[PDB]
């Protein structure tokens, strides 16, 4: 997250960290807990070698440095990458993860409600870079960013097709955005006093540049797919 600040315990209780354990262990992507046994993330998080039994999913965590061998984690039972996703391309950047065991809902880990509206009060969170050529951040970062219309987003990225299945968010003069390592995490907005998952963090040209909004997978346009794959 560029231009954000530190979050607090329980503030974003659906945020998870997707890590890979090889000799060393590292955070690769964010995700959103959507049910006891389901996490939503970005398909591109799985672009690397499809190694077996390396992923560890951490929920109810604030600081990456607090993770040790005794910290509990979830494991992957199944990865469901959207069938039409293609590597190095934007469309359908979405994946479901079924966990090996159901997680309990607590004060510190709870699901984000899925969307069924002009959203105000939208936030993006994660442990990604705080600047374009940066590094993973230790404490979960948060930033408040306005949505832009798809017509405006398309005007900013005339070199790509911004589809109705994407949603964009950014400031005209930049400075606040998601970045590398935030991929797969949530873009949440308020409605009726309740948080809803509006987007999955996907892409931008650079990070936080003026007139270059972040591009997110628009969750509402994947609800039929989510319901089909989870039932
Ligand atoms: C979350 C995030 N935010 C920003 N601002 C930048 C980020 C990021 C982090 N995002 C990634 O690193 C990343 C890797 N693959 N992808 C994203 C998929 C992707 C999505 C969209 C597009 C362009 N497009 C827009 C509409 C249609 N197409 C391209 C994609 O992949 C090509 C390679 C992506 C490289 C990204 C480097 C910078 O990464």
Swiss-Prot record:
Cysteines joined through disulfide linkages: 29-45, 122-189, 153-168, 179-207
Residue span(s) of domain Peptidase S1: 1-231
Glycosylation sites: 6, 63, 104
Active site per UniProt: 44 (charge relay system), 93 (charge relay system), 183 (charge relay system)
Superkingdom as given in the UniProt entry: Eukaryota
Protein name (database record): Plasma kallikrein light chain
Gene name linked to the record: KLKB1
Residues of the whole record sequence present: 391 to 626 of 638
């Amino acid at each position: 997250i560029v231009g954000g600040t530190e979050s607090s315990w329980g503030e974003w209780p659906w945020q998870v960290s997707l890590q890979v354990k090889l000799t060393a262990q590292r955070h690769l992507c964010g995700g959103s807990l959507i049910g006891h046994q389901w996490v939503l993330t970005a398909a591109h998080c799985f672009d690397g070698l499809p190694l077996q039994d390396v992923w560890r999913i951490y929920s109810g965590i604030l600081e990456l440095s607090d993770i040790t061998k005794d910290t509990p984690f979830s494991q992957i039972k199944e990865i469901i990458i959207h069938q039409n996703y293609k590597v190095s391309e934007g469309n359908h950047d979405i994946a479901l993860i079924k966990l090996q065991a159901p997680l309990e809902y607590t004060e510190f880990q709870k699901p984000i409600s899925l969307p069924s509206t002009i959203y105000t009060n939208c936030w993006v969170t994660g442990w990604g870079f705080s600047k374009e050529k940066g590094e993973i951040q230790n404490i979960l970062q948060k930033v408040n960013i306005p949505l832009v219309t798809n017509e405006e987003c398309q005007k900013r990225y005339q070199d790509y097709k911004i589809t109705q299945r994407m949603v964009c968010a950014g400031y005209k003069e930049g400075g606040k955005d998601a970045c590398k390592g935030d991929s797969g995490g949530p873009l949440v907005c308020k409605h009726n006093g309740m948080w809803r998952l509006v987007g999955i963090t996907s892409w931008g040209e650079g990070c936080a540049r003026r007139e270059q909004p972040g591009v997110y997978t628009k969750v509402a346009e994947y609800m039929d797919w989510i319901l089909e794959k989870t039932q």
